[PDB]
Design an enzyme around this catalytic site. Structure first.
Site, PDB file in Angstrom:
ATOM      1  CD  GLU A  54      56.785 -37.665  26.707  1.00 35.04           C
ATOM      2  OE1 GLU A  54      56.068 -38.024  25.809  1.00 35.04           O
ATOM      3  OE2 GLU A  54      58.244 -37.620  26.647  1.00 35.04           O
ATOM      4  NE  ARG A  65      52.923 -40.495  23.108  1.00 37.29           N
ATOM      5  CZ  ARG A  65      53.712 -40.052  23.909  1.00 37.29           C
ATOM      6  NH1 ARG A  65      55.012 -40.524  23.906  1.00 37.29           N
ATOM      7  NH2 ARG A  65      53.604 -39.234  25.008  1.00 37.29           N
ATOM      8  NE  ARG A  69      54.791 -36.889  22.430  1.00 34.10           N
ATOM      9  CZ  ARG A  69      54.318 -37.222  21.305  1.00 34.10           C
ATOM     10  NH1 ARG A  69      53.220 -36.843  20.934  1.00 34.10           N
ATOM     11  NH2 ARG A  69      54.912 -38.253  20.582  1.00 34.10           N
ATOM     12  CG  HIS A  85      58.445 -35.350  18.199  1.00 40.42           C
ATOM     13  ND1 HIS A  85      59.936 -36.105  18.228  1.00 40.42           N
ATOM     14  CD2 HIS A  85      57.682 -36.276  18.783  1.00 40.42           C
ATOM     15  CE1 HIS A  85      59.658 -37.438  18.890  1.00 40.42           C
ATOM     16  NE2 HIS A  85      58.458 -37.492  19.319  1.00 40.42           N
TER      17      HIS A  85
END
Length: 96
Positions: A54, A65, A69, A85
């Site tokens: 990731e 963060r 992703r 997420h």
């Protein structure tokens, strides 16, 4: 399951930045970038341990963060985007 495919041009520009970093092997802004993604919840197809990794997609203005992703799979052009997420994923099409 994967939600469908999305053209890279339809995702936030930061996703383009992360793919370019993945292509050059970094350096990456976050130390968590490049760790194994375990797919513990079986959302993505079942693969051996280490098949998925990731990387952060920066969220402008976030102190952390955030929730975006990119997960790569070992196969050619297999990259999934999550903006929630790891709840849902879309396969990224870099040709559009």
């Amino acid at each position: 399951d994967v939600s469908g495919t999305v053209c890279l041009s339809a995702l936030p520009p930061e996703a383009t930045d992360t793919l370019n970093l993945i292509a050059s092997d970094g350096p990456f802004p976050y130390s968590q970038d490049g760790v194994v993604f375990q797919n513990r919840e079986s959302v993505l197809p079942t693969q051996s341990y280490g098949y998925y990794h990731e990387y952060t997609v920066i969220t402008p203005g976030a102190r952390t963060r955030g929730t975006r992703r990119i997960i790569c799979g070992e196969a050619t052009q297999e990259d999934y985007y999550t903006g929630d997420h790891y709840a849902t994923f879309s396969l990224i099409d870099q040709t559009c």
